Amino acid sequence: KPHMNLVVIGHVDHGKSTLVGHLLYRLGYIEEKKLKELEEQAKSRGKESFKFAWILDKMKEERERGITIDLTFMKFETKKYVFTIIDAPGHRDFVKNMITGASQADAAILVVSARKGEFEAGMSTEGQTREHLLLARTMGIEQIIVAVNKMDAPDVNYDQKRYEFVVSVLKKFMKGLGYQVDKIPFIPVSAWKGDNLIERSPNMPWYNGPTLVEALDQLQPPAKPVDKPLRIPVQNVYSIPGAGTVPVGRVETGVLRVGDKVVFMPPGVVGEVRSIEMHYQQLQQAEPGDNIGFAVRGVSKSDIKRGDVAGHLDKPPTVAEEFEARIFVIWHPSAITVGYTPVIHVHTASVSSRIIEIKAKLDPKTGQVVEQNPQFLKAGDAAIVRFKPVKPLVVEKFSEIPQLGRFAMRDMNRTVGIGIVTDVKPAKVDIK
């Protein structure tokens, strides 16, 4: 069984967590006693219909707000594949976590809501059906399944007129981003009632397309960039007794084996890998695809954190003192200039980086040096610029390691632009 990382994206309360909640319960993985225990507590607070969501959502704020905030990781398997499913947050305040999830994803489920106003809020200027589709694309997610959720709702009622209409507007938008619009399944489902999740819904005989499980098995596994350096961007870092300090992350490139001495950049801390765990399975090695926990002798919890990237000492990950990049400005209120310092989201990292130069402007539909050292960039422009990270950042050239060299520029609770890194002035490798 090959392995694939699935990420769940969509606008706030369009039904990501209940989809993953109910989909697991139907495939067997949620206990009856647990599901109803969650229903009772859900009901005891003013949150009756968040029973499936509370399998995924856990924090004090997540349960009080009824909002996914950080990524929840879970495991299941179909006929053909075994999945790491990654329930990501909808709310605009936490799209930085959606990006860290998107950087690990081999494919995505775009949960869109067929309810009136909710689809429109998802696809408006500042919506997240739109933004997560943008961000998912730039982070490397090529495969995509879309689930037109909430078909059962009073203001929809299993309607085809709605399903055809919502698919129409998404098809127009995604073909702009450069997606294979005829090749991706648009599944009218209900996450709450469970329609089309595993077995065909009687309530939509007009459908004739694949169900969510049948669409999951449709997905092809990704290629494996082996014959490349070791890159494991860390997602989290735990202190689990029986193991010590164990960072968790997806391996993007190379091969991690037990006993390998590893270095975590930017900190420069070195540690021996003592064990490798994936879905509670003991591994002697991990390869591109594998989202693993890996214990490390020598490193402590205070030494490393999310955004740090692990590699062998042979060729450690590049710490960019400065870095050059080609970018495209999606939105900006006024104008971008030398000095501007948006947050650069690469792999699992989110680091402010000052634009220290604008080397050239470029035409957005072609891309040749129109102007040289322009005074400003505005929305709709593309350009070559030189960043200086406000704090130590790991990036890599897009030519060499594209997954560590593709990024979003965010600022002011909006995505300003997107870009790839074309050069890196590296930092002084400072090992202990």
């Binding site: 200027t125 943008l134 981003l177 450069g178 495209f328 999606i330 539909k365 897009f398 790839i420």
Partner: peptide, 9 residues
């Protein structure tokens, strides 16, 4: 808006 930009994506 006009967002048809590929960086070899």
């Amino acid at each position: 808006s006009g967002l048809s930009g590929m960086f070899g994506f």
